[PDB]
Amino acid sequence: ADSRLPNFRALTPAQRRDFLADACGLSDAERALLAAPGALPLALADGMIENVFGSFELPLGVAGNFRVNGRDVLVPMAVEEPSVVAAASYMAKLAREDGGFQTSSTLPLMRAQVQVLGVTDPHGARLAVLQARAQIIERANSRDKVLIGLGGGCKDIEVHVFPDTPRGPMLVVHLIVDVRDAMGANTVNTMAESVAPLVEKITGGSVRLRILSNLADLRLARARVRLTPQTLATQDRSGEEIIEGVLDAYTFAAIDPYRAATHNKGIMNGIDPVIVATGNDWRAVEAGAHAYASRSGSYTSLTRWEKDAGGALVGSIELPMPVGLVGGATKTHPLARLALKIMDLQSAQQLGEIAAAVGLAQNLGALRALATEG
Amino acid sequence: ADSRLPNFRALTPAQRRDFLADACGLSDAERALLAAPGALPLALADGMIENVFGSFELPLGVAGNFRVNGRDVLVPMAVEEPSVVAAASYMAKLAREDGGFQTSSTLPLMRAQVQVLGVTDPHGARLAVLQARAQIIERANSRDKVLIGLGGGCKDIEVHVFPDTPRGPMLVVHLIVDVRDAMGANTVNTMAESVAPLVEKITGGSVRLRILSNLADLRLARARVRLTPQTLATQDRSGEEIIEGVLDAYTFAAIDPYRAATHNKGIMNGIDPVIVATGNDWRAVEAGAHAYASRSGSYTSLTRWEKDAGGALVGSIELPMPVGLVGGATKTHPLARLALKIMDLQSAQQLGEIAAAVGLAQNLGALRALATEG
């Protein structure tokens, strides 16, 4: 596995495709899928969304040089904006000098909210629900033996109480569900529906919404990169000076929401195209990322940029990453399946980690460029 | 202009395309563009982003029944998720009973940030900059006579001071620029570069970042809808009961960020596909929307749902809407140009208003469904 892309700026799209096909060991059928338009026939698209009358193409590029937890990975990106793919590739190249990106993940835990109205003693009812947690978990897991056998399923519950609202008290049960390699929305929505009668019995209330939370802060991807001054040095600027410029740009985003919005937008320039190319739901990843960015009480940067004790630049990111390898468009779209093969993905967690590293690299590309522009 | 889509569930994609082509008076060439895949030849895609090796298709559907400020509009949506296009169409149908959606916009004002370091008297330097505002505005406008002649250009400046940061004091000049029908990023970035030497002279400091803000809170789209109880009544439920359920769901999103993230995600299910189909930058619209959602100190709902004095349900939305009709992918992508024709757009402002109405309708579809699910 080798993600270096020698001379890709000079190759034609056909030559880039043949190189990738060779590098990833794509079959002759998969190579054909890419060499002609229409990999998603309208008959397939017609079953994906409603009122289909055609298809809409995004350019599909590949970012090179990425290395994550010691393994090279080629990264397909479906996006319309110039500079994005080249900046990701270049920052990944610089990151190779320290051995690449280092990533980790929490378990793939999604929240399902069960909203209960009509309970006049919600704090006491919360204790009753928590006392019955084992029964509620068993009820949540009773319909999905396949997920259970994989090691997934509902693992825990939380209860949150909003005692004073314009609509009366609300008690909200969260089912915490390990969804393995799925995005998980339909799985956790169904579990929420399954536990509603039991929650109504325990609380005496009336269940209304039964729905996942897109603030997927129990399903986090993490990525870290370190670049020495010599790695960052250019003909015109020392690496030391570039590092100080990156730190000035980062602190600006940390203290000013007007800058943080642009700073985080740059991150999603890297993340969203990977999400789109793998057939995943880019609205869910956007909502989770930007909502997480405001968890402190102010909308701020999703990344951190620092200097370690020896003076090297260190970047880090932590953000919700609800993505899947199965289900939805990732199953039906022939090119989405091809994207997973190009990336050689083993789990949704791994896809989330690679995406977080691409977002971190994209952020660096923007900060480094903005700080070295004359 | 008529946006009703009779029997579209029963038609094939080819029949839907021929209907739309007839309804919008599409040319025979435009009809051909839609009837075969590959409306974006790789040679065109190769000039849009880097390392192009192919293209990636999204399903392209049309949401029907939308009526905005008294004018019917057909709405193309590029997205991968089921239920989205049908829910938007259905809620637009219900909105027709009150005459459709009512929308408005601010002027198309974008912020460019000019970050100044090294100023030890930033509050005093801010007064010096504000005193020189006329000179700075004239300097910002000196290179873009075409934009000026259209009525655009830099109209005002603000100065914000961060006197105590881990990197020293920062003084940030905002150029407030009317960008007419462009998204505006490259226009305002260039103006920021043009005023940097003058800002350095006035302040004695050193300009670092010169870059637009994606928190485009001076470029707002607004949309409102009203639905009576009889309009919302179903076979199984009174309109009165459905309205109370929508209000319960809305208040949940207003007080709980875990719900607000899902609630706002549903809005972007409506907005982003329009943005993608018109060749616009969906990361910019996402960043602006979700950052605006946290402006109060908590991440909360972008919409408001209320009951008016007679008992009708009233929904409203206000959010940044940086979009364009010219430049970027909206010029190069043949289907993006076709999307603008289908929508018959007269200004970027109008596109922003239609998108905000689609987001409001999409939100209602989710709240109404979640509240009427048994």
Cβ atoms of A67 and A91 closer than 8 Å = no
DSSP A184-231: -HHHHHHHHHHHHHHHHHHH--EEEEEEE-S--TTSEEEEEEEE-HHH
CA-CA distance, A59 to A73, in Å (whole number)? Answer: 20
End-to-end CA distance of chain B: 38
Angle at A246 between CA A244 and CA A248, to 5 degrees: 70
Query: What SS3 state is found at A292?
Result: helix
Report how far residue A198's alpha carbon sits from residue A196's, in angstroms, rounded to the nearest whole number. Answer: 5
Q: Tokens 């250009």 correspond to what residue?
A: B153
Look at A370 and B209 and tell me if their CB atoms are within 8 Å: yes
CA B216 remoteness from chain centre: 10
- DSSP letter assigned to residue A101: B
Q: Which helix (H) or strand (E) holds A310?
A: none
Q: Experimental method for this entry?
A: X-ray
Contacts of A370 in chain B (CB under 8 A): 208-211
Map chain B to HEC letters. CCCCCCCCCCCCHHHHHHHHHHHHCCCHHHHHHHHCCCCCCHHHHCCCCCCEEEEEEEEEEEECCCEECCEECCEEEECCCCCHHHHHHHHHHHHHCCCCEEEEECCCEEEEEEEEECCCCHHHHHHHHHHCHHHHHHHHHCCCHHHHHCCCEEEEEEEEEECCCCCCCEEEEEEEEECCCECCHHHHHHHHHHHHHHHHHHHCCEEEEEEECCCCCCCEEEEEEEECHHHHCCCCCCHHHHHHHHHHHHHHHHHCHHHHHHHHHHHHHHHHHHHHHCCCCHHHHHHHHHHHCCCCCCCCCCEEEEECCCCCEEEEEEEECCCCCECCHHHHCHHHHHHHHHHCCCCHHHHHHHHHHHHHHHHHHHHHHHHHCC
Which of A49, A116, A335 would you mutate first to test chain B, the one with the most B CBs within 10 A?
Answer: A49
CB atoms within 10 A of CB A150: 14
- Of A187, A218, A249, which residue sits at a domain end? A218
Taking CA–CA distances from A283, the nearest residue in chain B reads B265
Q: What is the DSSP letter of A109?
A: E
Distance CA A278, CA A289 (A): 18
Cα–Cα dist B39/B12, whole Å: 20
Number of neighbouring beta carbons within 10 Å of residue B109: 22
Chain B residues with beta carbon closer than 8 angstroms to that of A252: 115, 167, 170, 172, 208-209
A262:B213 CB<8 A: yes
Q: Could you list the residues of B known to form a binding site for NAD(+), using ranges.
A: 144, 181, 183-184, 186-187, 214, 281, 328
Judge whether A79 and A274 are in contact, CB under 8 Å: no
Is A156 part of any known ligand binding site? Answer: no
Same domain? For B36 and B89 the reply is yes
Nearest-CB residue to B113 (from A82, A258, A276)? A258
Do residues A24 and A159 share a domain? no
Nearest CA in chain A to B170: A252
Query: What SS3 state is found at A108?
Result: coil
- CA A102 remoteness from chain centre: 16
Q: What is the resolution of this structure in A?
A: 1.9
User: Residue A270 corresponds to which tokens in the numbers above?
Assistant: 């890297």
At A239, list the tokens: 């690496």
Query: Can you state the angle between helices B133-141 and B185-203, rounded to 10 degrees?
Result: 140
CA distance A207 to B115: 51
Q: Report the gap between the CA of A182 and the closest CA in chain B (Å).
A: 15
Distance between CA atoms of residues A313 and B114, nearest Å = 24
Non-local CB neighbours of A122 within 8 Å, separated by 6+ positions = A116, A161, A162, A163, A169, A170, A171
Distance CA B287, CA B185 (A): 14
Q: Which residues on B lie below 8 Å from A371 (Cβ)?
A: 208-209
Q: Cβ contact (<8 Å) for B167 and A9?
A: no
- Which CATH number characterizes residue B366's domain? 3.90.770.10
Nearest CA in chain A to B206: A374
Alpha helices in A25-62 (DSSP H): 28-35, 42-45
Cβ-count burial A56-65 (b if 16+ within 10 Å, e if not): bbbbbbbbbb
Q: CA angle B272-A103-A274, nearest 5°?
A: 25
Structure tokens at B90: 């259905």
Q: How far apart are CA A355 and CA A49, in angstroms?
A: 26
Chain-chain contact of A282 with B272 (C-beta, under 8 angstroms) = yes
- Backbone region of residue A217 per phi and psi (left: phi > 0; alpha: psi in -120 to 50; beta: other values): alpha
From B49's Cα to the closest Cα of chain A, the distance in A is: 4
- Domain containing A365: what range? 1-106+219-373
d(CA A170, CA A4): 54
A75 and A123 belong to one structural domain = no
The C-alpha atoms of residue A331 and residue A343 are separated, in whole angstroms, by 15
Chain B interface, best mutation among A7, A8, A50, by max B CB count within 10 A: A50
b vs e for B212-247, b when ≥16 Cβ sit within 10 Å of the residue's Cβ?
A: bbbbbbbbbbbbbbbbbbebbeeeeeebebbbebbb
Domain identity same for A100 and A240: yes
Residues A74 and A208 in one domain: no
| Cα–Cα dist A358/A269, whole Å | 9
**Left, alpha or beta for A243 (phi > 0: left; psi -120 to 50: alpha)?**
alpha
Residue length of chain A: 374
Joined together, the tokens standing for residue A44 give: 């397939």
The CA distances from residue A83 to A61, A89, A366, B48, in Å, are 11, 10, 10, 9
Picking from A170, A209, A251, the nearest residue to B166 by CB comes out as: A251
B81 with A40: Cβ contact below 8 A: no
Q: Is residue B12 domain-shared with residue B130, that is, in the same domain? A: no
A332 in helix, strand or coil? helix
B73 and B1 in contact (C-beta within 8 Å)?
yes
Q: Rounded CA gap, A261 and B319, in Å?
A: 14
List, in sequence order, every residue forming a beta bridge with A227; answer none if it has no partner.
Answer: A313
From the CB of residue A191, how many other CB atoms can be counted at a distance below 10 Å? 30
What are the two backbone dihedrals, phi and then psi, of residue A316, each rounded to the nearest 5 degrees?
-150, 155
Same domain? For B86 and B225 the reply is: yes
Domain end position, chosen among B203, B218, B233:
B218
Give the containing element (helix H, strand E) for A360. Answer: helix A348-372
Mention every residue, 6+ apart, whose C-beta is less than 8 A from residue A95: A65, A66, A67, A101, A225, A227, A361
In 3D space, the residue among A272, A269, A258 whose CA is nearest the CA of residue A365 turns out to be A269
Residues A178 and A192 in one domain: yes
- Is A121 one of the annotated binding-site residues? no
> What are the structure tokens assigned to B340, written together?
């603008």
Helix axes B334-343, B348-372, angle to 10 degrees: 80
Residues A239 and A176 in one domain: no
Distances in Å between the alpha carbon of A88 and those of A97, A102, A363, B186?
Answer: 15, 16, 9, 20
* Closest to A335 (Cα-Cα) out of B148, B58, B299, B264: B58
Which of the 8 DSSP states describes residue A326? B
- Please identify, among B218, B245, B278, the residue that sits at the C-terminal boundary of a domain: B218
Domain count, chain B: 2
Cβ–Cβ under 8 Å, residues A174 and A113: yes
Residue A325 and residue A258 share a domain? yes
- List the CATH number of the domain containing B174: 3.30.70.420
Q: Do A113 and B329 touch (CB under 8 A)?
A: no
| Whole-number Å distance between alpha carbons of A117 and A136 | 18
Q: Measured between alpha carbons, how far is A62 from A65 in angstroms, rounded to an integer?
A: 10
Terminal Cα-to-Cα distance of chain A (whole angstroms): 38
CA B109 from chain center: how many Å?
13
Name the minimum distance, in Å, from the CA of B48 to any CA of chain A: 6
To the nearest whole angstrom, how far is the Cα of A99 from the nearest Cα of chain B?
Answer: 23
Output the CA–CA distances (angstroms, integers) from residue B137 to A289, A353, B198, B205, in the order listed. 36, 45, 11, 19
Mutate to test the interface with B, among A19, A56, A110 (most CBs of B within 10 A): A56
User: With an 8 Å Cβ cutoff, are A80 and B111 in contact?
Assistant: no
Instruction: Give CA B54 to chain center in angstroms.
Output: 28
Residue that is written with structure tokens 């009668």 in the block: A197
CA distance B159 to B129: 8
């919404």: which residue's tokens? Answer: A209
DSSP characters for A123-189? HHHHHHHHHTHHHHHHHHHTT-HHHHHTT-EEEEEEEEEE---TT--EEEEEEEEE-TTB--HHHHH
Probe site for chain B from A255, A262, A368 (most B CB atoms < 10 A): A262
Q: How far apart are CA B41 and CA A4, in angstroms?
A: 26
Task: Let me know: does A5 contact A77? Beta carbons within 8 Å.
Answer: no
DSSP reduced 3-state for A70: coil
Residue A281 marked in a binding site:
yes
Q: Does residue B257 share a domain with residue B336?
A: yes
Q: Do the annotations mark residue A46 as ligand-binding?
A: no
Nearest to B294 among A288, A294, A333 (CB): A294
Rounded to the nearest angstrom, the gap between the alpha carbon of residue A152 and the centroid of all alpha carbons in its chain is 19
The span from the CA of B136 to the CA of A169, in Å, is 54
Q: Crossing angle for the helix pair A84-96 and A257-277, nearest 10 degrees?
A: 90
Same domain, B161 and B300: no
User: Which residue type is seen at B46?
Assistant: D
CB nearest A252 (choices: B209, B256, B293): B209
Q: CB distance A50–B294 less than 8 Å?
A: no
**Closest residue in A to B174 (Cα–Cα):** A258
